[PDB]
Amino acid sequence: KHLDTALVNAGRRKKYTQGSVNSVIQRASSLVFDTVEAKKHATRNRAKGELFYGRRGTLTHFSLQEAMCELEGGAGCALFPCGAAAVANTILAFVEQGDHVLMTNTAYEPSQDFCTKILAKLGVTTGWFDPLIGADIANLIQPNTKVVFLESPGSITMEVHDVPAIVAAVRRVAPEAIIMIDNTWAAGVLFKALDFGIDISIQAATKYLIGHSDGMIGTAVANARCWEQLCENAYLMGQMIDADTAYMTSRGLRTLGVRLRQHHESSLRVAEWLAQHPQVARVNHPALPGSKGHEFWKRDFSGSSGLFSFVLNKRLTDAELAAYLDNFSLFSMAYSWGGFESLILANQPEHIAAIRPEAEVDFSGTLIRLHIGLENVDDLLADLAAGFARIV
Amino acid sequence: HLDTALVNAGRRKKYTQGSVNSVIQRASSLVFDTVEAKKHATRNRAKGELFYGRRGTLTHFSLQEAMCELEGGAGCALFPCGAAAVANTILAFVEQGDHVLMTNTAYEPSQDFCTKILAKLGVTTGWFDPLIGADIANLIQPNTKVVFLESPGSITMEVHDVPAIVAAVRRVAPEAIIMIDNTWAAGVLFKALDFGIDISIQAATKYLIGHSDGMIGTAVANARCWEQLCENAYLMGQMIDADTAYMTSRGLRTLGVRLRQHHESSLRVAEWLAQHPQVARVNHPALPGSKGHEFWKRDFSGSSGLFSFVLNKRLTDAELAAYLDNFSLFSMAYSWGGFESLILANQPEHIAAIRPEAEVDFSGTLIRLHIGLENVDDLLADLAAGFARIV
Amino acid sequence: HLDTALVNAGRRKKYTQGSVNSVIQRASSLVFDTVEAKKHATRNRAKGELFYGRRGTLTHFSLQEAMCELEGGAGCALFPCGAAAVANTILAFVEQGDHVLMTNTAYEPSQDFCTKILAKLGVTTGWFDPLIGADIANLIQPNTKVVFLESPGSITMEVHDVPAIVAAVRRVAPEAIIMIDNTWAAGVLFKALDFGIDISIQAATKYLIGHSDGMIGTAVANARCWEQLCENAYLMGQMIDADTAYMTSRGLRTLGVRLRQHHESSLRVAEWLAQHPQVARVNHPALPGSKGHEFWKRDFSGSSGLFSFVLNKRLTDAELAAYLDNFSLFSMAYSWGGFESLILANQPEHIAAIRPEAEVDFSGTLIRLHIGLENVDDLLADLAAGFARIV
Amino acid sequence: HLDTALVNAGRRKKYTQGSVNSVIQRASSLVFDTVEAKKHATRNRAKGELFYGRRGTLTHFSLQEAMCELEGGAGCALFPCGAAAVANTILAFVEQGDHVLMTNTAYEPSQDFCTKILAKLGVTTGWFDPLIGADIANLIQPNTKVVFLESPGSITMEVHDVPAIVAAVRRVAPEAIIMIDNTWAAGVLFKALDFGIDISIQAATKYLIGHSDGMIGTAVANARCWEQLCENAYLMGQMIDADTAYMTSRGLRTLGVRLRQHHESSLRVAEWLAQHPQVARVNHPALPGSKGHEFWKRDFSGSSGLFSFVLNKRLTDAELAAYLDNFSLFSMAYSWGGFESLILANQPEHIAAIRPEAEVDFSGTLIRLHIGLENVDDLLADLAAGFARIV
Ligand SMILES: *Cc1c(COP(=O)(O)O)cnc(C)c1O
Ligand SMILES: *Cc1c(COP(=O)(O)O)cnc(C)c1O
Ligand SMILES: *Cc1c(COP(=O)(O)O)cnc(C)c1O
Ligand SMILES: *Cc1c(COP(=O)(O)O)cnc(C)c1O
Ligand SMILES: [Mg+2]
Ligand SMILES: [Mg+2]
Ligand SMILES: [Mg+2]
Ligand SMILES: [Mg+2]
CATH class of the missing domain: 3.40.640.10 (Type I PLP-dependent aspartate aminotransferase-like (Major domain))
Known part of the structure; x- marks a missing residue:
């Protein structure tokens, strides 16, 4: 209580x-x-x-x-x-x-x-x-x-x-x-x-x-x-x-509590939607049951923030990557995270394997990393849905 | 220019x-x-x-x-x-x-x-x-x-x-x-x-x-x-x-006008210190006779306001306090390069310890001054009052 | 949206x-x-x-x-x-x-x-x-x-x-x-x-x-x-x-998330104060029964965290000090709208003096609270301790 | 001091x-x-x-x-x-x-x-x-x-x-x-x-x-x-x-060193303008002959860097563009008192319009200058090139 x-x-x-x-x-x-x-x-x-x-x-x-x-x-x-x-x-x-x-x-x-x-x-x-x-x-x-x-x-x-x-x-x-x-x-x-x-x-x-x-x-x-x-x-x-x-x-620090609670609520909602989506192969969100190490997050953490990732059901071509990422209305492409704005970034499997020393990745689709900001979650979901329609 | x-x-x-x-x-x-x-x-x-x-x-x-x-x-x-x-x-x-x-x-x-x-x-x-x-x-x-x-x-x-x-x-x-x-x-x-x-x-x-x-x-x-x-x-x-x-x-926009004042004021102070009966030597690149002055004269286009001098005597802790605690314009602080004048003291063994594989060539207390933008006659009066406290 | x-x-x-x-x-x-x-x-x-x-x-x-x-x-x-x-x-x-x-x-x-x-x-x-x-x-x-x-x-x-x-x-x-x-x-x-x-x-x-x-x-x-x-x-x-x-x-970027917390926490505090035996009246637009609450419900889309309540008695200056001086989390200050909870007292005659051509309709000391982003249980404990000091 | x-x-x-x-x-x-x-x-x-x-x-x-x-x-x-x-x-x-x-x-x-x-x-x-x-x-x-x-x-x-x-x-x-x-x-x-x-x-x-x-x-x-x-x-x-x-x-900490430079440079420019064949009048408080100069000399302890002068002729619209649009160091902007030099032009009737119940006593175009901290010989060369564009 403190x-x-x-x-x-x-x-x-x-x-x-x-x-x-x-x-x-x-x-x-x-x-x-x-x-x-x-x-x-x-x-x-x-x-x-x-x-x-x-x-x-x-x-x-x-x-x-x-x-x-x-x-x-x-x-x-x-x-x-x-x-x-x-x-x-x-x-x-x-x-x-x-x-x-x-x-x-x-x-x-x-x-x-x-x-x-x-x-x-x-x-x-x-x-x-x-x-x-x-x-x-x-x-x-x-x-x-x-x-x-x-x-x-x-x-x-x-x-x-x-x-x-x-x-x-x-x-x-x-x-x-x-x-x-x-x-x-x-x-x-x-x-x-x-x-x-x-x-x-x-x-x-x-x-x-x-x-x-x-x-x-x-x-x-x-x-x-x-x-x-x-x-x-x-x-x-x-x-x-x-x-x-x-x-x-x-x-x-003074607003970190109220901010993180919103980041948790919104990002878990988006992850649960993505987890049921036919164009998603895997959702990597610590607060989502089934995610890698979720049992440890549940036991050892008091909450979640808003950063997570998901794997698409296919490897996007260069043309598809441009069509997907260039036409978002609310998500912005940028490095870093943790702010009030929602961000999106893409990585091909081999890009991740190159930064997994002495290891390989266990997925073949394009990985999308999302930061879920403070926007209305229904607006963010509509943005992602439009993105899915551009790469179907 | x-x-x-x-x-x-x-x-x-x-x-x-x-x-x-x-x-x-x-x-x-x-x-x-x-x-x-x-x-x-x-x-x-x-x-x-x-x-x-x-x-x-x-x-x-x-x-x-x-x-x-x-x-x-x-x-x-x-x-x-x-x-x-x-x-x-x-x-x-x-x-x-x-x-x-x-x-x-x-x-x-x-x-x-x-x-x-x-x-x-x-x-x-x-x-x-x-x-x-x-x-x-x-x-x-x-x-x-x-x-x-x-x-x-x-x-x-x-x-x-x-x-x-x-x-x-x-x-x-x-x-x-x-x-x-x-x-x-x-x-x-x-x-x-x-x-x-x-x-x-x-x-x-x-x-x-x-x-x-x-x-x-x-x-x-x-x-x-x-x-x-x-x-x-x-x-x-x-x-x-x-x-x-x-x-x-x-x-940067005021760097030129500031440096010119630091040069003028600090060289005036160094020239006065160089003739002073309680000062053993003045270390100022723009002062003739200072170590490497001929290289400063040849290779530099000017001077800033930081320099040092060696007192004739090694101040005791009591003299160091009487000297440094009672300046009206010079302040004790680290760093330099600002608008305020600053003063710091080091004993010879303190300098010797940070001169690796070398010896110091002085025995008195070393005073480092930064000359700021105050009126130089006010700063000289402050230094003269200080000398009277360590006679 | x-x-x-x-x-x-x-x-x-x-x-x-x-x-x-x-x-x-x-x-x-x-x-x-x-x-x-x-x-x-x-x-x-x-x-x-x-x-x-x-x-x-x-x-x-x-x-x-x-x-x-x-x-x-x-x-x-x-x-x-x-x-x-x-x-x-x-x-x-x-x-x-x-x-x-x-x-x-x-x-x-x-x-x-x-x-x-x-x-x-x-x-x-x-x-x-x-x-x-x-x-x-x-x-x-x-x-x-x-x-x-x-x-x-x-x-x-x-x-x-x-x-x-x-x-x-x-x-x-x-x-x-x-x-x-x-x-x-x-x-x-x-x-x-x-x-x-x-x-x-x-x-x-x-x-x-x-x-x-x-x-x-x-x-x-x-x-x-x-x-x-x-x-x-x-x-x-x-x-x-x-x-x-x-x-x-x-x-602006955090205003929505902040206001929602100010609303929830201040309404919880108001609901507790509204049942408290040492409180005469709670003035919170979001609390049913408050003056103009029906207009707030109809015309507003939410509440902020600022409100006031009337104590059952007019505190003397001695009681006012015992009350206000010993809060642990609420701070005494002017303004409001921040992340910190604030408390400010006004005696009924103070308010009447700034109600031109009108009188006040209460006789106890008026306490204005801004409810910040702290844990409400801690805020309630602070308020409870205050009541104990004036009971 | x-x-x-x-x-x-x-x-x-x-x-x-x-x-x-x-x-x-x-x-x-x-x-x-x-x-x-x-x-x-x-x-x-x-x-x-x-x-x-x-x-x-x-x-x-x-x-x-x-x-x-x-x-x-x-x-x-x-x-x-x-x-x-x-x-x-x-x-x-x-x-x-x-x-x-x-x-x-x-x-x-x-x-x-x-x-x-x-x-x-x-x-x-x-x-x-x-x-x-x-x-x-x-x-x-x-x-x-x-x-x-x-x-x-x-x-x-x-x-x-x-x-x-x-x-x-x-x-x-x-x-x-x-x-x-x-x-x-x-x-x-x-x-x-x-x-x-x-x-x-x-x-x-x-x-x-x-x-x-x-x-x-x-x-x-x-x-x-x-x-x-x-x-x-x-x-x-x-x-x-x-x-x-x-x-x-x-x-404030650099105001003294800055003002002395603004004074020195702006008066040098004013003295050059005062003897220039394309200039009718120079309005600088520190310049002999300027209106009220005797009061400045008696009542002020120095000058800043803002002043004006009147050209021998009234520039046409085309000449104004040729003059003002092609300076290399002077910039066109309002306000003054900074490290950069500025230039602005006003026709006589513009000034008369802001001289209530009065008329102006000049017919040439008025140029207002702020002299900043740049090298004054560079600024003079910029003004000289401007004169050559309208001669
Ligand atoms: C962004 C990031 C960093 C680097 O932080 P910077 O402030 O941008 O240098 C370090 N660790 C993690 C986990 C990060 O996401
Ligand atoms: C002060 C000083 C430094 C260190 O600068 P900081 O900004 O204080 O870290 C480095 N070199 C010289 C010569 C210095 O005098
Ligand atoms: C605080 C207050 C003001 C004055 O605001 P300042 O920014 O402090 O000048 C005006 N109206 C209301 C309702 C206030 O509470
Ligand atoms: C610029 C100016 C003002 C107005 O100053 P601002 O800070 O720009 O409002 C007032 N008096 C004189 C003489 C000025 O030149
Ligand atoms: Mg690898
Ligand atoms: Mg040594
Ligand atoms: Mg009244
Ligand atoms: Mg007029």
Whole structure:
């Protein structure tokens, strides 16, 4: 009986708000020390919420960091220019040459590319696992495995991990490993990752936290064991976010509850319609019974967001792809998601297989990924129905 | 002239659309009307076509065009701050087994990135005296990949002989990546890429923003190194928000009038300090006798407002408090490049600890000043009152 | 299809230019490429062509198009806040010797504009009971130029019978300008222009912005009244900054989902208060039995989250402090329409003083609540704890 | 010490909270922790205690303090733009039956406010020649309540003899409200309140913002007039958004270095125009021979960069296009006070139409220039090429 109240109030303390409802926006590089003693005090608390230097943050950042720590149950929150920077720099913060990373083969493609194109040449190897491996992940853990990287639901194809089984297996074989999750789909709040034994919860706050498709920012909330190393190594890479975007992220939290409930209701309705449609082969929605890992979503999540995908009954030709995608009236073609607008994107099976390392896909039709926004669901259904008629 | 270029750089109709300044386009998602439009945007995702917010919007493109014009580069990568620009530009060009050769006067966070991040990834770092000049050739190893310059040096303000260093590097390792932290010159008082440096890095936070209220890093690369810088910085998710990019473009418009005042005022202060009976030496690139001044005179078109001086005595903590706590106009803070004057102190052992494989040549307390836009006679009176407190 | 319209209103390519939201164009000067371009912009300076910052930029045009679509008007004037919109919209249609007829439940600053500004300029003001309905015809004078409505009324929440009032006004004074402060409905829960009202005024500060961090007023006029409103507001220099206009457009996108929560939660709180032994009366338009509820049910498509209730006793200043000072979730502040729940107390004599020529019909302290987006159980517990402190 | 005052004005710890610049506090609702705190805020709602966003936040308070310090006033009211500041400051001091006496060189929208808004409200307007000096006494009527000055005049740049005007007004109507549009001087090059003027009004849009990307009006009043200005502007809902207030404070920090460049460059251009064979007259307050130059020299501490000149001939329509359409650096746009140079043309009869009860004394085409921060030799070359197109 608290999440909605926590979202409205998280990070909103008088020291940050100074009498307004929202935190003040403190734009600053230089932060002034009135005395040498004040400078000494600030230096000793430069990572503990005392004004020291803009790269460590201002009151606006401290307010957002407190909100993220409260909502995701962590000991600290690092901020980044975008989600991709959060993933790359959080992984980097915990590896050194000779280490091994174990990542789900459904990870967001830029996350994979960071591992294969940056980490590889820096002496860090990456292995892969099927998202439904569950307890069998233990057999893949090597003596030098330092990081296990989860993403539930997976990117595009939406497979849900059995996180309890994975975490228990990792803690049995490699108790000191750093378990991370890209928790963007859950907005960090529909899946309480740190309560499951995960060490760090990473978000592209760009998506649901910002909620309006007009700001970019990454967050990483770490437990007490991992916070200091994440904080100091992210700082050595100069990672931070501007004060105004931090303000807009805090601001987005306030409507996250009401927004996510609509995204859940509308997207599940669309998925249930698609699941009965003669032109659809498969619907990948975590909240839909029968979807991959749905039993884990039902057990471990408190709700759903609005992003999912479905497979058409056929592989669209280039001409059919253009006829389908070019003539939507409400859905817009774009990258990213999590805003008020509904989006659509297409992928051929071989496009997905190319970003499923050491694995193949199990479908042959064209995959359509939908983000269901805040439009009237009957209008969205009519848009999709017209699209079906263009490719029949 | 530079003042005209600063006023107009990056201001094209496609960005400004009737206003004086570029529009502010806040976006993650960028919409493709057709599959063909998406294909075109993908092909030009790094060439100023709208593709995805992490690659930029019209606002970023305008700033990038301004920076390329002003610094004479093929591309400009953007970062959340100067420290991110340095760390990720170096990282973009190294791999396990490589070697980085860096001036021992590099900004401390730049050194810390090398010794704490690169070292654990199998990338080693070596050091050189800022005045080493042509003799840097003897320090280039078979695996040296990056040569990192910073002229003037951090805090102590030594000016490199860049033509001598570059010629020496190109004689031994013509393919090496030469980088410079060009923040003190705001990228315009020293045309790094015209000297054969490959990448000019800036904490745009300082003079480009110019008001101490935004943080952003830039890296302008020549044609040979741009694609690797662009794509590897992108793989690390590096970008800046649209509003800060707008404020950086906006800062350019007054950069000329601001720098001229910083130069005039700071040189007056340095000249007075150079004759002062409590001052051992003044480190100001524009002051005759300062280390590398002849190279500043030859290679720079002007000066900014940041410099340092060494006191005759080592202040005690009690004297440091009496001195610094009671200034009326100078403020204690990190960073610089704004309209306000700032002051910071370092003891010699503090500087020695960030001069790897080298010794300091002074024993008194080192004071770093940023000279802002206040009336210079008011600033001189503030400094004179300070001297009276540490007699 | 209100949710769809809210998501798309004002979003045309010329404004969004590839992003989901409009670009932010900050500008005073707007540049003309040729003499012919200057002529064209001058003729269309009030018709959505870039002429001068005071007339607006692309960002303002986007919001104005959205507001005209959502409220079904011919034009939308923008103002620095709701009070500026009310004051200047009334002023735009009066001259010396005119008469204004205003509901006695009007927002107090709206009353004060009439009694302190209009009065000294030769414009008189008369008052009517919010439930007068068709009997307003007897109050219309030959010089009555404006009839000003506010439904539900400020604080006490009485709902007008707008159809009866409009029909009566048109019978007697067909040319009179009928205005309404439609802030409680966010302009969308009550379609004022469809009822024959001429101008719908909003403190967009409230639900359109929706986060308590921006101030802006809007006034949407029908075709008959738009040109006069537009030009007379412009002569008073009324405008809003581009960034606030952007944030207002942005607020529209979540307005439907927000209002539905405000409706559900506030009605649940009202139903609990209506059975509470320490409550004398609940003033919620959506609650059966409230003053004008039958008119809300018939004429509105929903409810927002602002309402009030009367305590069984008039709290003393000591009891008022014990009550208000110790709420954990409700905050004491002016304004409303945000994500946070707010509480504000008015003693009955305070209300009577801002009910011109009328008395109040209650004797307990009046508590006005804005129900935000918090968990209702927590809000009820906060209210329950308050009751325990004054029982 | 103006540069030092500009850097530090309004920058107190209560507003800056550790940063160099004031915090940006966006707010409508301002929370009261207790009933006692609310009573204190209510009592001091116009005295810098947080009460309600329409009265201001910390950001507004900081700007107001800076403006009061820089212009030597008791209070500073904020408006959405300069036109709103003029219209509402006049309206704040008149009532039906009053008379306004305004210079016939007043900014045209200021005149249109008087003839189109004030007139229908029973307030009349008279006019005087800007060089009338002591002879203004003969135009003061028993009901003259406001005397409105603008020095230099709009477009034609005539400088008032303010001491002679004020002395005459105080002899005849000591209680009259003397106002001045002090935008050209940016409120700092002419200390209006020190001359006995009651209210100094500014389009802060111009030089205070300094970058053509924000609109805001200010009015600084002496102690005698502050309360009436403050409360009556508030009844009209006049305010500015927090972010623009921040950007205005920020513009102050470079105002000194900018104005000195605008002065130096614009006077160089004026001196060149004054000796040019294609120029009939140059209207620049700092140029000897210009109308009222002796008053500028005596009463101002410097110049900005806006002025005008008259061509030797009346350009035809074709010549106007050839002249204005082909400039490379000067842009055609309204407003001024930014970093870019601007050019606009007016035929004599256009000016005569906005010179009430007066004619113009020139027959050539009038060119108004704003001289920005570009290199002045580049600007001179642009103007020279323009002369060659019409010779
Ligand atoms: C979008 C996405 C990212 C990248 O976020 P950006 O802010 O766009 O860099 C990371 N993880 C997931 C799951 C994403 O969908
Ligand atoms: C300040 C500084 C940096 C770091 O810039 P930030 O924007 O504060 O991260 C980099 N290089 C130099 C020379 C600096 O002085
Ligand atoms: C708040 C309020 C206003 C004034 O709005 P502001 O934006 O604060 O000026 C006007 N009308 C009503 C009904 C209000 O509640
Ligand atoms: C531009 C101008 C104004 C009006 O200022 P805005 O902010 O554009 O409304 C007022 N006075 C003078 C002298 C001006 O030039
Ligand atoms: Mg594969
Ligand atoms: Mg050493
Ligand atoms: Mg009464
Ligand atoms: Mg005339």
